[PDB]
C-alpha cells in the first residue's frame, strides 16, 4: 500500500516500479508491492 487510501490487493508480488503492482498498490523499497 501507498499513502493514498486506494484499493491495494493483498497479493505478494515482486516489483521494480509501481506499474508492476495491482490496483493502487505501489512498489515499496524492498521490491515487493504494498
Amino acid at each position: 500500500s501507498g499513502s493514498d487510501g486506494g484499493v491495494c490487493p493483498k497479493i505478494l508480488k515482486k516489483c521494480r516500479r509501481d506499474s508492476d503492482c495491482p490496483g493502487a498498490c505501489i512498489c515499496r523499497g524492498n521490491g515487493y508491492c504494498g
Partner: protein, 223 residues
C-alpha cells in the same frame, strides 16, 4: 498476518499455497478437486501446494498439484476488486486426510460480530520485510456494514465485508490474498484488499463468499 499467532503444523488443513516459482497467494480447498481463491491471484501455470506448514522446507505431508483450470469470476473488476473470487481446478484429485481436508461452503451470510479464523503466509509486519516460513493465524470478528462503509467511503460493494479491529494491530497483509476467512466452520470470506495492513480505522476487506455459493456450484458442475 499481522498481530497473529503461529497456527501449528497442519492445524488449518483446508489452507493451500498458490505457487508460481514462489508463494504469492493462499486458497481454500472446498472439495478434493477444487480450490477457492481471489480473482486477483490469477496466473497461468499455478501450482497448488497442500498440506504445507513451512513453505520453504519439505516436511513430508505436502501434495503439489498443478492447476488444470483457473476460473475468474466473469464480473471481476481489477480496479475496484468487485467480484474478487476465482475457482482453481486441480489436475488430479488431492488425497484427503487429517492434514489435507476441505472446508464447507456457507448456506447463508454471517452476521456482524461473528468470530472467524483468518490464515496465511502473508507479511507478519504491516510494512517492510517479514514474510514467514510457517502458517500464521488470526482470530477476528466480522464488522458491521456501517463500520465497513464508513471506514472505506465509496469503496465497499455488496460483495465485500470488513473483518478485524478498528483499533488496528491485527489484520491480513500482502501474501495472505486468496486465503480463508472461516467462521463457525464455514468459508465466509476470501482475503482481498485493504488500505495498508493493521492500521487504525482501516480493517481488512474480504470477498463475501455467501454471495457466490450458486456460482461456485454451477462452475464446479460444468467444469
Amino acid at each position: 498476518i499481522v498481530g497473529g499467532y503461529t497456527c501449528g503444523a497442519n492445524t488449518v488443513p483446508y489452507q493451500v499455497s498458490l505457487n508460481s516459482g514462489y508463494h504469492f497467494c493462499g486458497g481454500s480447498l472446498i472439495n478434493s478437486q477444487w480450490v477457492v481463491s481471489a480473482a486477483h491471484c490469477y496466473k497461468s501455470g499455478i501450482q497448488v501446494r497442500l498440506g504445507e506448514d513451512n513453505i520453504n522446507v519439505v516436511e513430508g505431508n505436502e501434495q503439489f498439484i498443478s492447476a488444470s483450470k483457473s476460473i475468474v469470476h466473469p464480473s471481476y473488476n481489477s480496479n475496484t476488486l468487485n467480484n474478487d473470487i476465482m475457482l482453481i481446478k486441480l489436475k488430479s484429485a488431492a488425497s484427503l486426510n487429517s492434514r489435507v481436508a476441505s472446508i464447507s461452503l456457507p448456506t447463508s451470510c454471517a452476521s456482524a460480530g461473528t468470530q472467524c479464523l483468518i490464515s496465511g503466509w502473508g507479511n507478519t509486519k504491516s510494512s517492510g520485510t517479514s514474510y514467514p516460513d510457517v502458517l500464521k493465524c488470526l482470530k477476528a470478528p466480522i464488522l458491521s456494514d456501517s463500520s465497513c462503509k464508513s471506514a472505506y467511503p465509496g469503496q465497499i460493494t455488496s460483495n465485500m465485508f470488513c473483518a478485524g479491529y478498528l483499533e488496528g494491530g491485527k489484520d491480513s497483509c500482502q501474501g495472505d490474498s486468496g486465503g480463508p476467512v472461516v467462521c463457525s466452520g464455514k468459508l465466509q470470506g476470501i482475503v482481498s484488499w485493504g488500505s495498508g495492513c493493521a492500521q487504525k480505522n482501516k480493517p481488512g476487506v474480504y470477498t463475501k463468499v455467501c454471495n457466490y455459493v450458486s456460482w461456485i456450484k454451477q462452475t464446479i458442475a460444468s467444469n
